[PDB]
Design a binder for this molecule. Structure first.
Ligand SMILES: COCO[C@H]1C[C@H]2O[C@H]3CC=CCO[C@@H]3[C@@H](O)[C@@H]2O[C@@H]1CC(=O)O
Lengths: 116, 107
């Protein structure tokens, strides 16, 4: 019954920004962490950051500080990730996920393409 | 926290057992998990806290280790096991994936 519904594909120009979102359904949104992960073409999974909707706490991979900003809206059970000052290397597939001892649910993944 | 996975890729026949390893740059207190990522599917959690099997996951999957060194194994290899596997440390409220291991099956 549990699912994470991820937002659609994005196309942006260099220097622009995009905001991806993920709506949770089937579990208590405010008592678990939500993770954001990146996967560039032909590369492995990379952690971006996490947010705990229940209190707004966030944790970031040092590499993504200044690039990604995580937020959450408890009334809509939605978590968002904003990517700022987009560049070529940001072109990749992004996933949202709640993955812990109690459940493992991932968004379908969405592409962000950065081109002139 | 850095994670180094080995091997980067391997080819094995059905019915056999394969083992992958992961090394952290510091003691992660057994807070390691293993994920399977099959092309066309989202990542899937298999093992956590080093040796605990996730509910609903086949007992053919197992893990062991301590300190900085951990291992993950798949016994009785099946065709559906073809995928890329990743270790994931989750200590200190952070996540760090290993580089991944691409597992290919032989027939
Ligand atoms: C980085 O996110 C915040 O830290 C939490 C990460 C969670 O990862 C899970 C990964 C895999 C399997 C099982 O549960 C892990 C979970 O215990 C871990 O919790 C972190 C927060 C905490 O330690 O309480």
């Amino acid at each position: 019954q549990v699912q994470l519904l991820e937002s659609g594909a994005e196309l942006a120009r260099p220097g622009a920004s995009v905001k991806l979102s993920c709506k949770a359904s089937g579990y208590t949104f405010t008592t678990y962490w939500m993770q954001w992960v990146r996967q560039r073409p032909g590369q492995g999974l990379e952690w971006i950051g996490a947010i705990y909707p229940g209190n707004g706490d966030t944790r970031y991979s040092q590499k993504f500080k200044g690039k990604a900003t995580l937020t959450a809206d408890t009334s809509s059970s939605t978590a968002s990730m904003q990517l700022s000052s987009l560049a070529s290397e940001d072109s990749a597939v992004y996933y949202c996920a709640r993955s812990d001892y109690g459940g493992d649910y991932w968004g379908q993944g969405t592409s962000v393409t950065v081109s002139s | 926290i850095q994670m180094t996975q080995s091997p980067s890729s391997l080819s094995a026949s059905l019915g056999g057992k394969v083992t992958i390893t992961c090394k952290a740059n510091q003691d992660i207190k057994k807070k390691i998990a293993w994920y399977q990522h099959k092309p066309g599917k989202g990542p899937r959690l298999l093992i956590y806290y080093t040796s605990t099997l996730k509910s609903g996951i086949s007992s053919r999957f197992s893990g062991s280790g301590s300190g900085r060194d951990y291992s993950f194994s798949i016994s009785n290899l099946e065709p559906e096991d073809a995928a890329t596997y990743y270790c994931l440390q989750y200590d200190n409220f952070t996540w760090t994936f290993g580089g991944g291991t691409k597992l290919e099956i032989k027939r």
